[PDB]
């Protein structure tokens, strides 16, 4: 029993909290739903599967294990790309987090009241003029938490209350992975999530919300950024294609049995998934006729559906100042850890190339030198206009990235490696074959399915929207240019491999390349070719 | 701001039936849970009913739990109590209430003007 609160634990995080509700909005909430649970039931859960399976089978890091196909390793390269870019603003998410929790420490919460200097006279208030109508949660968070401005490039000044916790955030992550309770940290997060749960499904207007969320659109699944979107999410939410999955597997024992682990986790992540979205559109239904605006444009937003909708909840709960301390430091506690499992797997990828104790005793300084990096990276995340970079990143550099990187290493595993041959090493220790579903999946399903979505995305390309504000051409350019910084690290590396290796041929070269290396497999009695 | 106005009690049988209405206005009432009591002469004031916002669910005290039938309607801005199979003991001041917290650490009781039921 204690073996599962293990499971559950890595099954909850920002990734869904946060990030899950916010894409399930934009892309219309029952709209999102359909496409979200098959492209997670065909193409996420087998490449989750299969990324356990390829490090626990070879035991070794994330790196280190494309000498099954040695030209790709541009592949495991990529993958520490789509974690640099993920660890360095997924940590103002965190920041954003610490200041409502440091909020939260008075007497009676902010953002419940319209009496406040940057309140408009717009403004409808809760607990206290216009023919639009904001919330106080919406203006707080808008206005007094990021003064955002109206472009990407007035970045006006820092906000200096966010740039100090964006220094707590840091040094609370990095004085863990110097130094470094399943009962607290796998329930913790359930029972405030009920807490809020209860109180968005007893506000009136939450069936409208629920309804919004749940009811389907037929008329927009010929959209293909919803299959994009969609895709995106099932791969971010289970950690595919971050490089961590194949990295902390490479430790687990050889004969663990990851079928039972791909499963367990997969559902009680779909299972959270599903209910952070529930709480949130239920808040939402209530803020809609409160607001007298429909539910499908109370906020078209982006990141703020979280931070503009859980302190609304919050202030409606009774001794609210209690849970709101609660549920920010229970934000707080899901960000660092999976942050110290995103730092940890990058730090011991990049040190692991490089001489042992030439730069494995460097572990410590390299460790403090990222962490000095991704400050200094992430203050452009702090600055006026926070939120439209923040977007940026998390809607091009590090969300369908994730979806090719993962496909790539289906295709580079099944028809070049050889189908035949991966289904007999998942047999070695897991006793037997990888099932009927997962054998199709890998085959033809997810790779046919991440083609023709990438096919018609290029096609149906629209520019990009946040509250309906269009980004600007420099700004997309570097969105494309972030989202194929990643991706380019396969077609780059074999350059540089295709110089190196030996043929002095046409298609020689690539089959030497291509085909495992020498050094390949477990270790001691772990084998049926020796 | 916050106000309160009870309606529809009086004198009944043992075995009658009577409607509280509650009006509320100065705040908005539809994101508030609406409460009952009742504190006969003498006696303290013991609970009778809660109703939620949306009204999913609500809740009683024993002595009344199988008989009274809390209700609202967010559109009207009101609160009801259909008080069914009325006995001697039911004889009370009743009182609408609501408890606002303030978003604070504490809570504020709001009362209604309380009108009596008196049942024989």
């Known amino acids: 029993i204690e073996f599962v609160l293990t499971s559950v634990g890595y099954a909850v995080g920002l990734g869904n909290v946060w990030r899950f509700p916010y894409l399930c909005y934009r892309n219309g909430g029952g709209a999102f739903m359909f496409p979200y649970f098959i492209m997670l039931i065909f193409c996420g859960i087998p490449a989750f599967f299969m990324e356990l399976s390829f490090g626990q089978f070879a035991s070794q890091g994330c790196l280190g294990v494309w000498r099954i196909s040695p030209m790709f390793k541009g592949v495991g390269y990529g993958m520490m790309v789509v974690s640099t870019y993920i660890g360095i603003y997924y940590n103002v998410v965190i920041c954003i987090a610490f200041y409502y929790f440091f909020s939260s420490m008075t007497h009676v919460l902010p953002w419940a009241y319209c009496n406040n200097p940057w309140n408009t006279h717009d403004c409808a208030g809760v607990l206290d003029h216009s023919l639009q109508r904001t919330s106080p949660s919406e203006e707080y968070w808008r206005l007094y938490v990021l003064k955002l401005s109206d472009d990407i490039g007035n970045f006006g000044e820092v906000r200096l209350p966010l740039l100090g916790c964006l220094g707590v955030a840091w040094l609370v992550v990095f004085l863990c992975l110097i130094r470094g309770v399943v009962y607290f940290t796998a329930t913790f997060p359930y029972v405030v999530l009920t807490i809020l749960f209860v109180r968005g499904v007893t506000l009136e207007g939450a069936f409208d919300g629920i309804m919004y969320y749940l009811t389907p659109q037929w008329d927009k699944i010929l959209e293909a950024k919803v299959w994009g979107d969609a895709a995106s999410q099932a791969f971010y939410s289970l950690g595919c294609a971050w490089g961590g999955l194949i990295t902390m597997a490479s430790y687990n024992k050889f004969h663990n049995n990851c079928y039972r682990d791909s499963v367990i986790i997969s559902i009680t992540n779909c299972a959270t998934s599903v209910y952070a979205g529930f709480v949130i559109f239920s808040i939402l239904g209530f803020m809609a006729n409160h607001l007298g605006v429909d539910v499908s444009r109370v906020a078209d937003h982006g990141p703020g559906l979280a931070f503009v909708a859980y302190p609304e909840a919050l202030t409606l709960l009774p001794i609210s100042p209690l849970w709101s301390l609660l549920f920010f430091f229970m934000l707080i506690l899901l960000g660092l850890g999976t942050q110290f499992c995103l730092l940890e797997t990058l730090v011991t990828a990049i040190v692991d190339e490089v001489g042992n104790e030439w730069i494995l005793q460097k572990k410590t300084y390299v460790t403090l030198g990222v962490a000095v990096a991704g400050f200094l990276l992430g203050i452009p995340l702090t600055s006026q206009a926070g939120i439209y970079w923040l977007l940026l990143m998390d809607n091009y550099a590090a969300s369908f990235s994730l979806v090719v990187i993962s496909c790539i290493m289906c295709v580079a595993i099944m028809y070049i490696y050889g189908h035949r041959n991966y289904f007999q090493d998942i047999q070695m220790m897991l006793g037997f074959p990888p099932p009927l579903f997962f054998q199709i999946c890998w085959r033809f399903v997810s790779p046919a399915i991440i083609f023709f979505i990438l096919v018609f995305t290029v096609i149906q390309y629209q520019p990009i929207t946040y509250n309906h504000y269009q980004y600007p051409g420099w700004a997309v350019a570097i969105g494309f240019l972030m989202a194929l910084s990643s991706v380019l690290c396969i077609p780059l590396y074999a350059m540089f491999r295709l110089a190196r290796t030996d043929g002095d041929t046409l298609l020689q070269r690539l089959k030497n390349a291509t085909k495992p290396s020498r050094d390949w497999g477990p270790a001691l009695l772990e084998h049926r070719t020796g | 701001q916050v106000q309160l106005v009870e309606s529809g009690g009086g004198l009944v049988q043992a075995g009658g039936s009577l409607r509280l209405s509650c009006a509320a206005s100065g705040f908005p009432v539809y994101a508030y849970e609406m409460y009952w009591y009742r504190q006969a002469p003498g006696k303290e004031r013991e609970w009778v009913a809660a109703?939620?916002?949306?009204?999913?669910?609500?809740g009683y005290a024993d002595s009344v739990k199988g008989r009274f039938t809390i209700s609202r309607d967010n559109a009207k801005n009101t609160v009801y109590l259909q008080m069914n199979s009325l006995k001697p003991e039911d004889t009370a001041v009743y009182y609408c209430?609501?408890?606002?917290?303030?978003?604070?650490?504490?809570?504020?009781?709001?009362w209604g003007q309380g009108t009596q039921v008196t049942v024989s």
């Open positions: 109703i939620s916002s949306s009204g999913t669910w609500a």
């Open positions: 209430n609501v408890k606002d917290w303030g978003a604070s650490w504490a809570y504020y009781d709001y």
